[PDB]
Enzyme design. Structure first.
Site, PDB file in Angstrom:
ATOM      1  N   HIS A  21      51.899  34.113  46.074  1.00  0.00           N
ATOM      2  CA  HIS A  21      50.538  33.621  46.344  1.00  0.00           C
ATOM      3  C   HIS A  21      50.325  32.290  45.661  1.00  0.00           C
ATOM      4  O   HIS A  21      50.029  32.214  44.459  1.00  0.00           O
ATOM      5  CB  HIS A  21      49.349  34.627  46.006  1.00  0.00           C
ATOM      6  CG  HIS A  21      47.921  34.095  46.333  1.00  0.00           C
ATOM      7  ND1 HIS A  21      47.029  34.878  47.069  1.00  0.00           N
ATOM      8  CD2 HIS A  21      47.258  32.922  46.053  1.00  0.00           C
ATOM      9  CE1 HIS A  21      45.891  34.194  47.204  1.00  0.00           C
ATOM     10  NE2 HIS A  21      45.954  32.997  46.616  1.00  0.00           N
ATOM     11  N   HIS A  23      49.445  27.804  46.697  1.00  0.00           N
ATOM     12  CA  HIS A  23      48.913  26.829  47.623  1.00  0.00           C
ATOM     13  C   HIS A  23      49.398  25.457  47.233  1.00  0.00           C
ATOM     14  O   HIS A  23      49.475  25.176  46.053  1.00  0.00           O
ATOM     15  CB  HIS A  23      47.359  26.700  47.507  1.00  0.00           C
ATOM     16  CG  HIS A  23      46.626  27.981  47.653  1.00  0.00           C
ATOM     17  ND1 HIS A  23      46.266  28.438  48.907  1.00  0.00           N
ATOM     18  CD2 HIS A  23      46.218  28.882  46.723  1.00  0.00           C
ATOM     19  CE1 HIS A  23      45.650  29.592  48.719  1.00  0.00           C
ATOM     20  NE2 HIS A  23      45.599  29.893  47.427  1.00  0.00           N
ATOM     21  N   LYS A 135      47.098  35.964  56.002  1.00  0.00           N
ATOM     22  CA  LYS A 135      46.188  35.959  54.877  1.00  0.00           C
ATOM     23  C   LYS A 135      44.752  36.266  55.292  1.00  0.00           C
ATOM     24  O   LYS A 135      44.208  35.618  56.187  1.00  0.00           O
ATOM     25  CB  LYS A 135      46.231  34.572  54.234  1.00  0.00           C
ATOM     26  CG  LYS A 135      45.108  34.263  53.221  1.00  0.00           C
ATOM     27  CD  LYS A 135      45.205  35.184  52.011  1.00  0.00           C
ATOM     28  CE  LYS A 135      44.112  34.944  51.012  1.00  0.00           C
ATOM     29  NZ  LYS A 135      44.198  33.602  50.431  1.00  0.00           N
ATOM     30  N   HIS A 167      42.848  38.242  49.599  1.00  0.00           N
ATOM     31  CA  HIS A 167      42.062  37.736  48.510  1.00  0.00           C
ATOM     32  C   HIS A 167      40.983  38.833  48.326  1.00  0.00           C
ATOM     33  O   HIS A 167      40.415  39.318  49.311  1.00  0.00           O
ATOM     34  CB  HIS A 167      41.428  36.370  48.797  1.00  0.00           C
ATOM     35  CG  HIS A 167      40.262  35.953  47.924  1.00  0.00           C
ATOM     36  ND1 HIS A 167      40.209  34.717  47.306  1.00  0.00           N
ATOM     37  CD2 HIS A 167      39.107  36.611  47.602  1.00  0.00           C
ATOM     38  CE1 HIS A 167      39.076  34.642  46.630  1.00  0.00           C
ATOM     39  NE2 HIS A 167      38.389  35.766  46.788  1.00  0.00           N
ATOM     40  N   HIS A 196      44.751  39.155  43.812  1.00  0.00           N
ATOM     41  CA  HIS A 196      43.824  38.795  42.780  1.00  0.00           C
ATOM     42  C   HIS A 196      43.466  40.046  41.985  1.00  0.00           C
ATOM     43  O   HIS A 196      42.420  40.126  41.368  1.00  0.00           O
ATOM     44  CB  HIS A 196      42.568  38.094  43.351  1.00  0.00           C
ATOM     45  CG  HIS A 196      42.815  36.849  44.167  1.00  0.00           C
ATOM     46  ND1 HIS A 196      43.953  36.058  43.996  1.00  0.00           N
ATOM     47  CD2 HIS A 196      42.061  36.264  45.147  1.00  0.00           C
ATOM     48  CE1 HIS A 196      43.869  35.030  44.860  1.00  0.00           C
ATOM     49  NE2 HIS A 196      42.744  35.112  45.585  1.00  0.00           N
ATOM     50  N   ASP A 199      42.555  40.483  38.258  1.00  0.00           N
ATOM     51  CA  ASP A 199      41.234  40.023  37.957  1.00  0.00           C
ATOM     52  C   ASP A 199      40.305  41.141  37.371  1.00  0.00           C
ATOM     53  O   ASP A 199      39.193  40.841  36.974  1.00  0.00           O
ATOM     54  CB  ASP A 199      40.598  39.430  39.215  1.00  0.00           C
ATOM     55  CG  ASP A 199      40.809  37.969  39.433  1.00  0.00           C
ATOM     56  OD1 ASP A 199      40.274  37.396  40.350  1.00  0.00           O
ATOM     57  OD2 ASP A 199      41.588  37.373  38.548  1.00  0.00           O
ATOM     58  N   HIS A 220      46.789  36.013  39.184  1.00  0.00           N
ATOM     59  CA  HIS A 220      45.876  35.120  38.526  1.00  0.00           C
ATOM     60  C   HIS A 220      46.185  34.944  37.035  1.00  0.00           C
ATOM     61  O   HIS A 220      45.358  34.444  36.251  1.00  0.00           O
ATOM     62  CB  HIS A 220      44.460  35.666  38.717  1.00  0.00           C
ATOM     63  CG  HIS A 220      43.848  34.987  39.874  1.00  0.00           C
ATOM     64  ND1 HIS A 220      42.545  35.206  40.243  1.00  0.00           N
ATOM     65  CD2 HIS A 220      44.378  34.086  40.729  1.00  0.00           C
ATOM     66  CE1 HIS A 220      42.299  34.443  41.303  1.00  0.00           C
ATOM     67  NE2 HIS A 220      43.384  33.756  41.621  1.00  0.00           N
ATOM     68  N   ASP A 267      48.731  31.638  41.849  1.00  0.00           N
ATOM     69  CA  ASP A 267      47.589  31.146  42.604  1.00  0.00           C
ATOM     70  C   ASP A 267      47.314  29.713  42.178  1.00  0.00           C
ATOM     71  O   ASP A 267      46.176  29.297  41.978  1.00  0.00           O
ATOM     72  CB  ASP A 267      46.307  32.038  42.563  1.00  0.00           C
ATOM     73  CG  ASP A 267      45.302  31.707  43.649  1.00  0.00           C
ATOM     74  OD1 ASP A 267      44.132  31.938  43.546  1.00  0.00           O
ATOM     75  OD2 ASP A 267      45.788  31.093  44.700  1.00  0.00           O
TER      76      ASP A 267
HETATM   77  C1  LIG Z   1      37.409  28.329  46.214  1.00  0.00           C
HETATM   78  C2  LIG Z   1      37.754  29.420  45.198  1.00  0.00           C
HETATM   79  C3  LIG Z   1      36.506  29.788  44.394  1.00  0.00           C
HETATM   80  O1  LIG Z   1      38.388  30.598  45.806  1.00  0.00           O
HETATM   81  P1  LIG Z   1      39.942  30.764  45.762  1.00  0.00           P
HETATM   82  C4  LIG Z   1      40.453  30.982  44.219  1.00  0.00           C
HETATM   83  O2  LIG Z   1      40.424  31.864  46.675  1.00  0.00           O
HETATM   84  O3  LIG Z   1      40.457  29.391  46.316  1.00  0.00           O
HETATM   85  C5  LIG Z   1      41.799  29.258  46.847  1.00  0.00           C
HETATM   86  C6  LIG Z   1      41.796  28.266  48.004  1.00  0.00           C
HETATM   87  C7  LIG Z   1      42.729  28.761  45.741  1.00  0.00           C
HETATM   88 ZN   LIG Z   2      42.200  33.681  46.816  1.00  0.00          ZN
HETATM   89 ZN   LIG Z   3      44.851  31.667  46.755  1.00  0.00          ZN
END
Ligand SMILES: CC(C)OP(C)(=O)OC(C)C
Ligand SMILES: [Zn+2]
Ligand SMILES: [Zn+2]
Ligand SMILES: CC(C)OP(C)(=O)OC(C)C
Ligand SMILES: [Zn+2]
Ligand SMILES: [Zn+2]
EC number: 3.1.8.1
Lengths: 329, 329
Positions: A21, A23, A135, A167, A196, A199, A220, A267
């Site tokens: 996970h 980006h 996703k 998510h 996540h 969390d 996370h 993440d």
């Molecule tokens: C925008 C935030 C608050 O949400 P998140 C943590 O899923 O964002 C991704 C795109 C990293």
């Molecule tokens: Zn997320």
């Molecule tokens: Zn993410």
């Protein structure tokens, strides 16, 4: 047999150490193309990503799954370019997150299914690059629309064998509702990763899901605003739990016998426009290791806590492979 | 002196008969590229557009202002191609509509200003095509975000001389609140067009704005679900007032001495993904003339009701020219 990457298919064995996970950039559909200067420049962002990916690679990371969807502003061409440059495999995704525009919001479950199938089978946009994962997301009780997404995700997964990853708002126990919808669609929990999840401290919730066959995404780990309570925004985003706290959840799960169901990640990202301006600076300060945080910090930590290397290997190599391999019923 | 089109700058005299509020396609950021099939295909879409524009051209239309913003999924490349193939000038826009993604929603007035200037001064995306108008929107009381958009719009307009055009919920008198914001920024009403104004029967509201110097956009003339009450979605979208009723508002404003303050259009499109599936079919049934509706039905109608040809020319040629000419304070 083979896993779809932005550079094409690779065999399962080629995946190696995989970050499930991540980006390259957290943004919005068309944003990068419309306002590249928000990130300095498209070039600066690409260079930052390349450097970051090379560092992870040096640390042992072979593949990363970029779970950016259309609404996260996923730029496949950007992924392809950095993958080639850093020599790290990158798995692209289809699905929807929580910022879908009207054109998507008004679609039916059947329409969405076709869209996800498109991305997986035909390719993203006109690139011919195929998504290797789906996703989806919720942030507390699913909206009617999110319910539809989850069902389309399930259908697409059932037709292609590609896994689904999510998510959640772990605290709200989102995973339970997610699982319910997936199961209602006939989807095997083994094709699903509830993310996540580190969390929350509720090990009760975690083992429940685990016991059910779901994959638990502890991604996370490095998110922590400890020593940043000074910053509301950061605090809101990162939390106040330390990384060790989160890292310990991994051990707990292992302890309960759920080693085969754990997936770990950071993440992380190199650009982030879907949040307050400059949040990146804050992130980088918090975790200068970027995506290498896991292999450089977490693994050794767990090692010191008693986790057998063998087990660590299973979690970072075996699990991801098993999860990513397209599998039909 | 010059107006920026998707094919480059043109002199004022070249604009000729202009439709001030139209769309080639009504969508969302990145949608056309990710799911072209939604419209059959990109090629189909373009063809439909070319045909429609040639028909309008045949009718006397020389230029159209495509008010699609980044969040309306504006594709300048698509605009440039159709403009070229139909030989119709197309003015592109910058600004934001009511479906902004998180990357936009979280920006400050200062950031937004930058983005708007970018599109106007430097160009859209990496094309070098410059916007010739700023599009903003409210649908009832402005949200806090929308107020920022309005302020940014005004600042961008003050720096460049480019006019501002808006989407309103006429029945809710949005124009009043819009004007208030604009004036607070120092923007001259003569640089603003309050659109969808024919959506209300309240001439008093219209005349008060006109009196203040604003331009009134009567651009929903052919929108009518009359004879289709059997369809909720359509009714919801087009309303139940007849085209004649809307057209008459044009004569009414003229009769009241505001001919120089009127702009007329169709708010037509060739593709529309931001609404229910198959909405186009309904629309094309309702108005087979598409963008030629104005010259083919409305002008004659008005003539027939006593409006002198000369006045008609002033509205379709002169007003738009004055409006579009970049004008600094
Ligand atoms: C925008 C935030 C608050 O949400 P998140 C943590 O899923 O964002 C991704 C795109 C990293
Ligand atoms: Zn997320
Ligand atoms: Zn993410
Ligand atoms: C989506 C509808 C209801 O709003 P509108 C009329 O501004 O849409 C345009 C962009 C065609
Ligand atoms: Zn509108
Ligand atoms: Zn419009």
């Amino acid at each position: 047999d083979r896993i779809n990457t932005v550079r094409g298919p690779i065999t399962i064995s080629e995946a190696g150490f995989t970050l499930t996970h991540e980006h390259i950039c957290g943004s919005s559909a068309g944003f990068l193309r419309a306002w590249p200067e928000f990130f300095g420049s498209r070039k600066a962002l690409a260079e930052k990503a390349v450097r970051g990916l090379r560092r992870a690679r040096a640390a042992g990371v072979r593949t990363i799954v970029d779970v950016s969807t259309f609404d996260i502003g996923r730029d496949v061409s950007l992924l392809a370019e950095v993958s080639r440059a850093a020599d790290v495999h990158i798995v692209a995704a289809t699905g929807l997150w929580f910022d879908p525009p009207l054109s998507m919001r008004l679609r039916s479950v059947e329409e969405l299914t076709q869209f996800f199938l498109r991305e997986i089978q035909y390719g993203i946009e006109d690139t011919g690059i195929r998504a290797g994962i789906i996703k989806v997301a919720t942030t507390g009780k699913a909206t009617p629309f999110q319910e539809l997404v989850l069902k389309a995700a399930a259908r697409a997964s059932l037709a292609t064998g590609v896994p689904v990853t999510t998510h959640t708002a772990a605290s709200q126990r989102d995973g339970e509702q997610q699982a319910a919808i997936f199961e209602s669609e006939g989807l095997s929990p083994s094709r699903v990763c509830i993310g996540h999840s580190d969390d929350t401290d509720d090990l009760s919730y975690l083992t429940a899901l685990a016991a059910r066959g779901y994959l638990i995404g502890l991604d996370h780990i490095p998110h922590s605003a400890i020593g940043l309570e000074d910053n509301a925004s950061a605090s809101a985003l990162l939390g106040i739990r330390s990384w060790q706290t989160r890292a310990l959840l991994i051990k707990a799960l292992i302890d309960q016998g759920y080693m085969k169901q754990i997936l770990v990640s950071n993440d992380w990202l190199f650009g982030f426009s879907s949040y307050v301006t400059n949040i990146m600076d804050v992130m980088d300060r918090v975790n200068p290791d970027g995506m290498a945080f896991i292999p450089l910090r977490v693994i050794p930590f767990l090692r010191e806590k008693g986790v057998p290397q063998e087990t660590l290997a299973g979690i970072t190599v075996t699990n991801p492979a098993r999860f990513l391999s397209p599998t039909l019923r």
